[PDB]
Amino acid sequence: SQDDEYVKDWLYDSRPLEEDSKKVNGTSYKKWSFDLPEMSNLYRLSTPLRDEVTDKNYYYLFDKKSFFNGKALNNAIPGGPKFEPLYPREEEFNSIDRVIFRVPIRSEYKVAFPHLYNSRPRSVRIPWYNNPVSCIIQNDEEYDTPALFFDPSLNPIPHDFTLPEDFAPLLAEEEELILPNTKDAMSLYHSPFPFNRTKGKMVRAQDVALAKKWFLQHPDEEYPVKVKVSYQKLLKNYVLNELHPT
């Protein structure tokens, strides 16, 4: 109690809110819409199965289009899957007599900028060049900091006429700059697709892919051979599913 007060009445049902009407379409159970305390509680309880990768800039060599370039160029990514070459390619101009060797062209260049570092690419999708630098403050101190404060990682900043007395600012009626849901709502606002919003339709229980989050990230640290092979093969299934819209 007192930490999961909004969701405990209905988290463990067969269908959670099929009977109630202010949260769900009906008992046909085809649309949902949540209040933000319920929603922030569902965000907080689901730390082990959500994306803590909230930046979109993390998927630099790891997109769908990056893997499409790795497939189309016979080319491996360290976290990425390996494929057959789409083109069997064999054999004065680009010989070592005429090549200044300064930068050894790693394959991450050939997947990053695919038309520059590849002589003869084709069937190559144009990769998503970067998002801006996401400077998201994580607020990870034990529910002790307010929603608006000066983070320890933030750099410091080294820098008659009269009016009526009752001339007030706008929103001068309220004192509170933040609310008891503001530290939760701002954390919800930067979350990825399942938690980024407070209404939606019902994506079925077999179509809410929960482990798909885990191999679309990098492997964490020092996992053995068979687990990195598992990440690589599940990415291979993912990219063979995304190359072919049926």
């Binding site: 930490d3 999961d4 730390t47 082990p48 803590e52 034990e142 529910y143």
Partner: peptide, 29 residues
């Protein structure tokens, strides 16, 4: 560092074992 959820060391919030609040192992194989 340590865990934001429980305060214990070793693991992060994505792999904590207590519910988010605002030892012996079958081994030697």
């Amino acid at each position: 560092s340590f865990c934001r959820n429980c305060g214990e060391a070793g693991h992060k919030e994505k792999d904590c074992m207590e519910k988010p609040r605002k030892v012996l192992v079958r081994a030697t194989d």
